[PDB]
Structures are given as structure tokens and as C-alpha cells.
Ligand binder design. Structure first.
Ligand SMILES: O=C(c1cc(O)cc(F)c1)c1cc(O)c(O)c([N+](=O)[O-])c1
Ligand SMILES: O=C(c1cc(O)cc(F)c1)c1cc(O)c(O)c([N+](=O)[O-])c1
Lengths: 116, 116, 116, 116
């Protein structure tokens, strides 16, 4: 599992469950070719997005549908979504966890990169 | 100013100076039109991007060039940029501060909104 | 002002108004002496806590009463308070902004330091 | 495992390894009785701090030795430590994860509470 996305809820103090996540890879014409997508689990985690051989170097975009998450909870959100754009495996492939901590008017995102 | 952008550096504990910022607005045909741009000052703040007349209802995108900021300090950061996308003035005119707190592998963003 | 405290609300996207703040300084016998206190203004800012003469080298503690803030909005938050402890003026006098961004189950804090 | 502490590094984009963590429970005289302690693993996590029967309702303090972590990496830090103070199991015991995302001049902390 070379790429995982984890989403947390700072209002409830819980994983953010059933959050839609879309991943894209930058094409040669600099438009976003869809790559993988899913919804976060009961633990706020989305596994199995890609494979070691498919996850080559390049620029990737992770789009987290924060607006729908807050709307489903009946809370007014600020952002249309939370986008995270990064370059992958530029010094070799590792395991990437892209985490996001969500509030209605603010979010925090980090990368936690480890080696197996 | 109806729209201000403020950028801080969590590694040095200081304003993030000379950070390029580009603002776009979503057009009726769903494309991103360039709206305003500038660089943060010595205080980390970017003022004067727009006017109350020009800053109509719409969906706006603030793109903060975090990568060039870190590269100039010798750091290869994780993110290509930090993008903040939001609906503005849905309930009438407001003043928006878009703040970002930067680390090489993480950032936080928040909105501070006041009613003039 | 050599020491300013700023508190923001990540749920409403606004300054956190009327937040009580207590400052302490570590004495030679390792106890915490009350140094200054106040409440955040309409802008979320607390100015006027100390003077350049009084704000000598030392270890300072800023205690932000986040619990009363959330309780007054009907929310039972996770944290009892947010405490920020730091050495000040180790390399000569500086101006410190201590910022906190509040959610019911999470907070972020940062220091913005400038040289007068 | 009713209580876990997880510490991340926003500069390196990695778990924060070998970070000292001390937990205390508030006594009746309002001083901090030590409760449990440990060091974070290769994954940034500290497990096994207490048991279901020992982790009763009360106010707990988690002290994360952020200063030593940054010093060992040769990086100037702002804070003396990161303290998280909270009330536990006030509506029944769950599983508490206390997470902290560290930068030299800033940190973010959240609670992720789940039920088994
Ligand atoms: O967004 C923040 C912010 C972000 C965080 O992750 C943590 C935190 F304590 C504050 C911010 C906004 C502002 O308008 C502002 O002036 C400042 N400041 O002065 O330092 C900060
Ligand atoms: O990135 C974070 C994170 C972000 C913040 O703004 C503040 C903070 F304390 C942690 C994170 C990453 C993980 O992999 C993870 O498991 C968790 N967790 O379970 O709690 C959190």
C-alpha cells in the first residue's frame, strides 16, 4: 500500500467517515488525469488506492470532498474541498500517508512518509 | 480590504515574506479566470488584492506558491503549492483573511471573516 | 507590545472573542508567578499585557481558557485549556505574537517573532 | 489500549521517533500525580500506557518533550514542551488517541476518540 489517505474531524474528535477522496496524476498537457478514488472507512482511512508498480514518480493531486462531509453533518463549511498537490517518490518510492484534520473554516494537512 | 492573505513560517516562527499568491475566480463556463496576484510583505501579509465593488459573489481560488518559498531556503518541500477554494459573499459582502501556516511537509489554513 | 496573544475560532471562521488569558513567569525557585492577564477583544487580540522593561528573559507560560469559551457556545470541548510554555528574549528583546486556532477537539498554536 | 499518543514531524514528513511522553492525573490537591510514561516508537506511537480499569474518569495531562526532540535534531525550538490537558471518559470510556503534529515554532494537537 504505497498511498493512503486519512481524514480526521476536529469538531467531533473522531475519524471523518465516508469522506469522498479523488486522486489524480498530472498529464503531459498539465491537466489532471483521474488515477484512483474512494471513501474513508470507519477509521477515517482510505487504503488500496494504487500499487507499487502503478505509483510512479510524478505530480499527484488528492482532492478531499470536505464540503459534502460538513453538509451531511448540518454544519456550514468554508471550503469547496481540500486539495493536496505533491511530487511523489523523487528519491525512490516509500509509503505515503496523506492526512487531513478538518474543521468547518480551517484544515491542516501533513505527509507522513515511511519505509518498509 | 475585502480580501487579505497572510502567510506564516512555522519553522522560523516568523512571517513568510515574498510568497507569491495568485487569486482566480470561477467563470460561468466553469473555468478559472485570473482575478488578482501579489507577494507577501515583510509582515507576511498581502493587502490590496481587490475592492468591495470588484469582489462580487463567486467561487474563488487562492494559490500560495509555497514551493518556491521553501526552495529559496534550500528545502525541497512536499507540496507543490497550497490552494484554498471557497465561496465568497454568499450572504452579502464580508471581509476575508485567508491565513496559511507553513512547514516543509505540512500546512494549515484558516479563514477569518468579519462583517464590515 | 512585546507580547500579544491572538485567538481564532476554526468552527465559525472568526476571532475568538472574550477568551480569558493568564500569563505566568518561572521564578528562581521553579514556581509559576502570575505575570499578566486579560481577555481577547473583538478582533481576537489581547494587547497591553506587558512592557519592554518588564518582559525580561525567562520562561513564560500562556494559559488560554479555551474551555469556558466553548462552554459558553454550548459545546463541551476536549481540552481544559491550551497552555503555551516558552523561553523569551534569550537572544535579546523580541516581540512575540502567540496565536491559537481553536476547534472543540483540537487546537493549533504558533509563535510569530519579530525583531524591533 | 484505552490511551495512545501519536507524534508526527512536520519538517521531515515522518513519525516523530523517540519522543518522551509523560502522563499525569490530577490529584485532590490539584497537583499532578504521575500516571504513565514512555517513548514513541518507529511509527510515532506510544501504546500500553494504561489499562481499562486504571483509566478512570478524571483530568489527565499529557506532556510531550518536544524540546529534546528538536535539540537532538539540531533545530532551534520555541516551546519548552507540548502539554495536553483533558477530562477523560465523562460519558463512558472509549479509546483515546492524543495526536500531536510538531514544528519548531508551532504545534497542532487533536483527540481521536473511537469505540470498540
Ligand atoms: O491562521 C492562523 C493560525 C494558524 C495556525 O495553524 C495556528 C494558529 F495559532 C493561528 C493565523 C491567522 C491570523 O490572522 C494571524 O494574524 C495569525 N498570527 O498572527 O500568527 C495566525
Ligand atoms: O496528521 C495528523 C495530525 C494533524 C494535525 O493537524 C494534528 C495532529 F495532532 C495530527 C495525523 C496523522 C495520522 O497518521 C494520524 O493517525 C493521526 N491521528 O490518528 O490522530 C493524525
Amino acid at each position: 500500500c504505497p498511498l493512503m489517505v486519512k481524514v480526521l474531524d476536529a469538531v467531533r474528535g473522531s475519524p471523518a467517515i465516508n469522506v469522498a477522496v479523488h486522486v489524480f496524476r498530472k498529464a503531459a498537457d498539465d491537466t489532471w488525469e483521474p488515477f484512483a478514488s474512494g471513501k474513508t472507512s470507519e477509521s477515517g482511512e482510505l487504503h488500496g488506492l494504487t500499487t507499487e508498480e502503478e505509483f510512479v514518480e510524478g505530480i499527484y493531486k488528492v482532492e478531499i470532498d470536505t464540503k459534502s462531509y460538513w453538509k451531511a453533518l448540518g454544519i456550514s463549511p468554508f471550503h469547496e474541498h481540500a486539495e493536496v498537490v505533491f511530487t511523489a517518490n523523487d528519491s525512490g518510492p516509500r509509503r505515503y500517508t496523506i492526512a487531513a484534520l478538518l474543521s468547518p473554516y480551517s484544515y491542516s494537512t501533513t505527509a507522513v512518509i515511511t519505509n518498509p
